Amino acid sequence: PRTLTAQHLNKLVSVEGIVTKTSLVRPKLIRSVHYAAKTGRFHYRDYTDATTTLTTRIPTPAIYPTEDTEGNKLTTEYGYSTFIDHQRITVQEMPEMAPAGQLPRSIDVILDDDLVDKTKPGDRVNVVGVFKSLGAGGMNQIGFKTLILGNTVYPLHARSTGVAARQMLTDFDIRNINKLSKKKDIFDILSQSLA
Amino acid sequence: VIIDLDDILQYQNEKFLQGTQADDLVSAIQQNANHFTELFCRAIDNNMPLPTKEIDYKDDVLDVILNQRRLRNERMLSDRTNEIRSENLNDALREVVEDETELFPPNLTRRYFLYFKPLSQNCARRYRKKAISSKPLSVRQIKGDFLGQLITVRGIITRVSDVKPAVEVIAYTCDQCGYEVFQEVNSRTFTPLSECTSEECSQNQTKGQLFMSTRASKFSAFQECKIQELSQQVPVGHIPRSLNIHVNGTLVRSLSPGDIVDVTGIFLPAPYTGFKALKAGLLTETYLEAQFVRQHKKKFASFSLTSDVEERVMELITSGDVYNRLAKSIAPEIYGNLDVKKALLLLLVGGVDKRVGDGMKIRGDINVCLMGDPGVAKSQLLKAICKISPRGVYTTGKGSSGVGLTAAVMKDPVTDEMILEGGALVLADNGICCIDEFDKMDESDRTAIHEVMEQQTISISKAGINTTLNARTSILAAANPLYGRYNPRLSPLDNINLPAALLSRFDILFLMLDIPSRDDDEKLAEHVTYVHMHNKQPDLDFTPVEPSKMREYIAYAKTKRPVMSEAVNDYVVQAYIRLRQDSKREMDSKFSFGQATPRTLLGI
Amino acid sequence: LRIIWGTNVSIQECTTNFRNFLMSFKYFINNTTDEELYYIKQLNEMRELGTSNLNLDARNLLAYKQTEDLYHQLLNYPQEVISIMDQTIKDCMVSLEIETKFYKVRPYNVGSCKGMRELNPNDIDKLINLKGLVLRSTPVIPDMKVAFFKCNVCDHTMAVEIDRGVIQEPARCERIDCNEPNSMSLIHNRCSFADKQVIKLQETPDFVPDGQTPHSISLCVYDELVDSCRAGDRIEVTGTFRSIPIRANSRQRVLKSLYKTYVDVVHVKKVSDKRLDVDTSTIEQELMQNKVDHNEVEEVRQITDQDLAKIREVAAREDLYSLLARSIAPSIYELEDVKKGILLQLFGGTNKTFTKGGRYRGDINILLCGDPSTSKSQILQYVHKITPRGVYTSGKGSSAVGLTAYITRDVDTKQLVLESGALVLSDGGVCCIDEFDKMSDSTRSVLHEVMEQQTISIAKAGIITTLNARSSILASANPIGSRYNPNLPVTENIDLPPPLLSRFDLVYLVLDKVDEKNDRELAKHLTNLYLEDVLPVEFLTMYISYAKEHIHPIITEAAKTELVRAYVGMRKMGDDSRSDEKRITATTRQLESMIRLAEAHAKMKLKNVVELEDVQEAVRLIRSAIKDYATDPKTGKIDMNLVQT
Amino acid sequence: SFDRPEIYSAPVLQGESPNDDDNTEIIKSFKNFILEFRLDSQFIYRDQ
Numbered sequence A: 001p002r003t004l005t006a007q008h009l010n011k012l013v014s015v016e017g018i019v020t021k022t023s024l025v026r027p028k029l030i031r032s033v034h035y036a037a038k039t040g041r042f043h044y045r046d047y048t049d050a051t052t053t054l055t056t057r058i059p060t061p062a063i064y065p066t067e068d069t070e071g072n073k074l075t076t077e078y079g080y081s082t083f084i085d086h087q088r089i090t091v092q093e094m095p096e097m098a099p100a101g102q103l104p105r106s107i108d109v110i111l112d113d114d115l116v117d118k119t120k121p122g123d124r125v126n127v128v129g130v131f132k133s134l135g136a137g138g139m140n141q142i143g144f145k146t147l148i149l150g151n152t153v154y155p156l157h158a159r160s161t162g163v164a165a166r167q168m169l170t171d172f173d174i175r176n177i178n179k180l181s182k183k184k185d186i187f188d189i190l191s192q193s194l195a
Numbered sequence B: 001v002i003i004d005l006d007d008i009l010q011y012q013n014e015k016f017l018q019g020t021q022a023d024d025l026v027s028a029i030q031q032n033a034n035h036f037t038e039l040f041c042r043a044i045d046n047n048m049p050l051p052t053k054e055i056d057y058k059d060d061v062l063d064v065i066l067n068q069r070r071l072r073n074e075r076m077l078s079d080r081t082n083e084i085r086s087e088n089l090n091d092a093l094r095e096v097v098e099d100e101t102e103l104f105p106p107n108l109t110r111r112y113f114l115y116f117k118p119l120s121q122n123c124a125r126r127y128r129k130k131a132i133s134s135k136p137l138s139v140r141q142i143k144g145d146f147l148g149q150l151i152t153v154r155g156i157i158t159r160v161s162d163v164k165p166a167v168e169v170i171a172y173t174c175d176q177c178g179y180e181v182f183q184e185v186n187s188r189t190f191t192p193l194s195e196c197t198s199e200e201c202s203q204n205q206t207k208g209q210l211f212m213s214t215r216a217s218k219f220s221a222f223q224e225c226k227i228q229e230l231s232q233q234v235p236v237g238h239i240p241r242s243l244n245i246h247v248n249g250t251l252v253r254s255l256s257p258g259d260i261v262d263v264t265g266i267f268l269p270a271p272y273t274g275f276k277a278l279k280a281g282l283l284t285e286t287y288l289e290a291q292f293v294r295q296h297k298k299k300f301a302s303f304s305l306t307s308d309v310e311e312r313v314m315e316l317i318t319s320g321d322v323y324n325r326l327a328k329s330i331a332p333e334i335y336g337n338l339d340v341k342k343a344l345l346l347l348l349v350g351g352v353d354k355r356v357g358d359g360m361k362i363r364g365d366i367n368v369c370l371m372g373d374p375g376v377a378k379s380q381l382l383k384a385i386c387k388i389s390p391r392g393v394y395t396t397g398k399g400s401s402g403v404g405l406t407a408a409v410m411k412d413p414v415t416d417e418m419i420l421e422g423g424a425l426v427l428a429d430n431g432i433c434c435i436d437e438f439d440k441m442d443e444s445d446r447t448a449i450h451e452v453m454e455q456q457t458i459s460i461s462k463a464g465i466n467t468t469l470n471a472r473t474s475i476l477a478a479a480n481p482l483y484g485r486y487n488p489r490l491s492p493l494d495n496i497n498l499p500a501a502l503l504s505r506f507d508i509l510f511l512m513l514d515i516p517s518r519d520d521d522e523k524l525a526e527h528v529t530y531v532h533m534h535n536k537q538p539d540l541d542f543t544p545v546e547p548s549k550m551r552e553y554i555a556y557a558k559t560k561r562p563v564m565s566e567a568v569n570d571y572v573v574q575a576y577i578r579l580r581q582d583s584k585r586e587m588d589s590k591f592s593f594g595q596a597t598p599r600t601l602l603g604i
Numbered sequence C: 001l002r003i004i005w006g007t008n009v010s011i012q013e014c015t016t017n018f019r020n021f022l023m024s025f026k027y028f029i030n031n032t033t034d035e036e037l038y039y040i041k042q043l044n045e046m047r048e049l050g051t052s053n054l055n056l057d058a059r060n061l062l063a064y065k066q067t068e069d070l071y072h073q074l075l076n077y078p079q080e081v082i083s084i085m086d087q088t089i090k091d092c093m094v095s096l097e098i099e100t101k102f103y104k105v106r107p108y109n110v111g112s113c114k115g116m117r118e119l120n121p122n123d124i125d126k127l128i129n130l131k132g133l134v135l136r137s138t139p140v141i142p143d144m145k146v147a148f149f150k151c152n153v154c155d156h157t158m159a160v161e162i163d164r165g166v167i168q169e170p171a172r173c174e175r176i177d178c179n180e181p182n183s184m185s186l187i188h189n190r191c192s193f194a195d196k197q198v199i200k201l202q203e204t205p206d207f208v209p210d211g212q213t214p215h216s217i218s219l220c221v222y223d224e225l226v227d228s229c230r231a232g233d234r235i236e237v238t239g240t241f242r243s244i245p246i247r248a249n250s251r252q253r254v255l256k257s258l259y260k261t262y263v264d265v266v267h268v269k270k271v272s273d274k275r276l277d278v279d280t281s282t283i284e285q286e287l288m289q290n291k292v293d294h295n296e297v298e299e300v301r302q303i304t305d306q307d308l309a310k311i312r313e314v315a316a317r318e319d320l321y322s323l324l325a326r327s328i329a330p331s332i333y334e335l336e337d338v339k340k341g342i343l344l345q346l347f348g349g350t351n352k353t354f355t356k357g358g359r360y361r362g363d364i365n366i367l368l369c370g371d372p373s374t375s376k377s378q379i380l381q382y383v384h385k386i387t388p389r390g391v392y393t394s395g396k397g398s399s400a401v402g403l404t405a406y407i408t409r410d411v412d413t414k415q416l417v418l419e420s421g422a423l424v425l426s427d428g429g430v431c432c433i434d435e436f437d438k439m440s441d442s443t444r445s446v447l448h449e450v451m452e453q454q455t456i457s458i459a460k461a462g463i464i465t466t467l468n469a470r471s472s473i474l475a476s477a478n479p480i481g482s483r484y485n486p487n488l489p490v491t492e493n494i495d496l497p498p499p500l501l502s503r504f505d506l507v508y509l510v511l512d513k514v515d516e517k518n519d520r521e522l523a524k525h526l527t528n529l530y531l532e533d534v535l536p537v538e539f540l541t542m543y544i545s546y547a548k549e550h551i552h553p554i555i556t557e558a559a560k561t562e563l564v565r566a567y568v569g570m571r572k573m574g575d576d577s578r579s580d581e582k583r584i585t586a587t588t589r590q591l592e593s594m595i596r597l598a599e600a601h602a603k604m605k606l607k608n609v610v611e612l613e614d615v616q617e618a619v620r621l622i623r624s625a626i627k628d629y630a631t632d633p634k635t636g637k638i639d640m641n642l643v644q645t
Numbered sequence D: 001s002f003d004r005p006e007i008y009s010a011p012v013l014q015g016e017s018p019n020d021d022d023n024t025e026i027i028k029s030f031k032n033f034i035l036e037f038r039l040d041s042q043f044i045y046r047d048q
């Protein structure tokens, strides 16, 4: 987060640091379905925003339908609509790689749908994603709004930290682990190898 | 009106053995439950019997207006049929009159409520169906896929708000025309109407002014509850999460703080309330709409003697030996200590409270204290007795200090009022409080326990507070001797940290020492090592009463008030005389925890 | 049978139904007042006295066959029923100024109900009653009824009447000559206003469901009932149950869907049969103001002459002193010396006012030291519940700020207001401090001024003033260690500085001895209570209030001689045992204690003269409390063989 | 994600007595005229 500058915007990057805060997982409305009792018909609509497509589009600000093309009143069908989850997290440079006595640097990561609940505050993490500039930096009237749209989130383990360490076991590894057992001095061999 | 879906299942499975056709109404009710409320509501208005009690003077204020409006309804239909027959311009006449006239809609003439009762698992396992509704769920597991469905939750209640009115339809009266305007509200903020929207006023240039009529309006009873995860559901290393529940109608005042419950509700969205700068898309918040509440431990107040409570309390007694049977049914994995468990059962049952006259009370509830050397299972007994009681709290010495015992001042998010949040002592009112490591508490905390055990009220005089809390609680306490082990070389009170005046308030004081005995140790070890090998107790000639059946017998016992005669009084007087004569010689030589007092007679 | 829409009321029906009952009412029954035409005496005496308010009890009507209907109708539609009930009066009055004077009724016996928090939304616009303690009240607020408009082009003045809260501002001048659009201006000080006050009440219900922390309620009192309630008062209130929508914020005209609740008070009751009457010596000017304001809220109770005859019949009894001491706590088997101190504390000494400034008060202060496992705790509770104003405090649960005063934020107006403390709320009452020995030196500091001058001085941010705290102190202390040790002196048994021990009028050493006939009597006493002469509560409280109200004792020379002799004798004792703190050294406060106790004993028995018997009894009591009839004046030890029950 | 609230009405009481130059009274007088006015013995306008 300290060596990430304005010359790396619009490129895929890997960032190291510590997770300092996570927000509440909220639903996001995509498609909404309705019912008209005067015609027995169901209607739908779609919604989109700027944080779902990597390229810039022309905005379409559609509205929430309460009324039919003739004027019939519509009932909202909450069970038939589609919702997708959302979360935001903040990353900061790890305390044992940061310069002593100096204030730290941080970066915002946006996660959606399946990557929404993978970490907790106070974790070592590695994130990969696109470093995006958003909106207009006051030219319609500080600078531009910058954030990472996450695609990969890796938990990492370090000494004196709440993330556990696990390894993938190969069948070859299993064979040695199981072979060692039969010999009746397992305790001594494992004990003498402890520091 | 409580709708049970186990009824709907029986009806649809009856339309299948006889061979007719049907529809899958249960799944449609489950996955889109917010429409079927109104479908059912109007279907039931169409099917309605007649009243058979002429309105009298002992009927509610609401019913007078509801009855009046139906008469006013029928009057206008008859009136207009006559007037239409007058000009002579029996089926199309109805369709003419229907459209020509203005009537009170169905909603402002109903008086009943409609809730849905989840699909029982027992019924779904009989006809071979999979019950998504009666399956409980954590707070983490409820995601965006679950919006608009009928679901059940399992959690613990942290806060409950008061009862306040929620407006659903506002009523207005126009002096110019004499009509009545009804405005619908479904937001948290609304804008009142100003001018008339009647047909007459809408036509004529002169339009009347509106005023609010409080009595005619549509009001509902509203409460909002916070529910938290159980300890056994939180993943490894994370913190428990929360959720919001809403309650309307006659289901209010049913949840209280500190309860473990299963709530049936409909999962529905609400508008976003976060920071604008952090908004990306159409984000929404979630809440739960309560329909049916279950409690895992039934309270003693509710006890009403029906015929199945008769059946099982009538079997319990037919096998006799109830006192020992239910004394050994407390923690059947802890070896020994029968006399301690006999005292525990009596602390669970209690005594009799006496309004002596002048409005002065005697307490009728017993306080027990346990002392002993390390590793004698005192804390396990406290945990068990807190699991058996309907209301019961477990607390440790220094982790619950200050406002965590008595009460705190906070502002209510929902009602915008200044409330008092209760501590452990206020959560256990009409229950049992369990304190561990009694000797380590602060002096301030010990004063409160003193007061609660003497008169059952807590007095607070601090900045912003001058009140008296009503705390009817029984105290169970555990403590170690001052030097770890008991020193028989030292005096009995030299081994206990607490003052003797506190120990004079406990009804029964048990001292649980560990003197090594070769023989008894092999019977204790047998029990413990057996327990660690089999997850059951080691006795095959003894039945452990289930906690529910114990709660039932204790409630029925608590619904009785025995009284004392003169012959039994003689005995008590005579025993007290001799005990008072003997205690002095022991206390003179410094070999007693306490000289006999009147409080010993009250305890007896 | 015309029925008012939305109700079941017929106006003519109820007016005629009401006038027959008002002209004929019936009811251990007398033949002097229990069998006479009742309410025409009430009306005639009202018009004779020059009074405007009729106070109407409620259950009167649930017996008389006709007006039973009207009771249910009054408890459901208070708005429409009370306008019917007034027209009956002003019709009935001329039937017997009375063509331009307005009459009012005030129901005060509505019953049942189980507290504010058990009421549902279906109980809106209903009549309910409340009991509790008052904490705060905002100053008077002016409410507009008639408005004043001036035409700024023609100077024509118009007046408008408020209609259910709304004012209609004319658009066109009314003059036929000057007809302008929008020429009307509002002049605020030319308008007619009325009074409004807001009270905050700490509700004290009878049924408290499991786990209810105390809460507070808002009450609106209009017109006559202004300044009729003061903080610290225990009252009973009748009123209507309302709801109102509030605006989200000042700028927007938007409202909140969740409603706000309060009570419209109609009647206020400041008496109780089972409690004592307030001290008139502390509310002299409120009595004068009530008459000037013509509010008929009655503070003291009525005494008929049969009952006053009973008073002197009993006051003539030979064993008055024992009887009174016995009926104080009729369920606490205890020494009569302990009870006599509480009895004389209730009467209190004579309050004296100097005309050059300088006030002497007659408040008694008592300390109950002694072993635990005694009935001290019940005495404090019983005294809390018999005195009109009081607060109960624990030892290690109080702060100086919590006892004196503090600043708080009002959730309604969002401003900062001043609120009373424990000791100021106890003005003219009893304050009970339990576990006095467990209290910090910072908190014990504030009591010195209250025990010396009966005031408090506060110099904090926002307030610099002196407050009145005219309260009695009743304290209980725990001895050091397990039990009281007769082998040590008293100064070594109680953890309290010896100089502080001398500020109390009476010090009671409650000792426990093992003796077979005392134990037998106590056991029989206690066991008799779990089965199924004395003065009942009502008569005791009535007698005490009468004595505290009328008589005033003054001392004579024969008493002065004995007082001086006794003080000199007490000081001369232990003159050598002063350097070593064995016994409690005597000071001038003991002289003042003898004065106060002599005056209280004189007040009992209804005298205006303190004779020698009073001083002898006072000195007897002072010595008997400290157990000076068994103490060795050299070592400070008690012979328990001589301490008899 | 909620719906549209409604406003609806129903007659209850007699308002202020009707002025003859009211619009509704004009409509009612003209509706009486249509179905009442006679010339000879035929009700011309209803038939028309």
Ligand SMILES: Nc1ncnc2c1ncn2[C@@H]1O[C@H](COP(=O)(O)OP(=O)(O)O)[C@@H](O)[C@H]1O
Residues within 6 Å of the ligand: B333, B334, B335, B336, B372, B373, B374, B375, B376, B377, B378, B379, B380, B524, B528
């Ligand atoms: N009599 C006993 N029977 C069964 N288990 C016992 C017994 N005494 C001690 N234990 C076990 O030993 C441990 C004692 O822990 P604890 O209850 O905290 O004891 P203490 O309260 O004395 O500190 C627990 O695991 C308990 O199950």
Ligand SMILES: [Mg+2]
Residues within 6 Å of the ligand: B378, B379
């Ligand atoms: Mg332990």
Ligand SMILES: [Zn+2]
Residues within 6 Å of the ligand: B174, B175, B176, B177, B178, B179, B196, B197, B198, B200, B201, B207, B208
């Ligand atoms: Zn209108």
Ligand SMILES: [Zn+2]
Residues within 6 Å of the ligand: C151, C152, C153, C154, C155, C156, C173, C174, C175, C178, C179, C180, C183
């Ligand atoms: Zn003018």
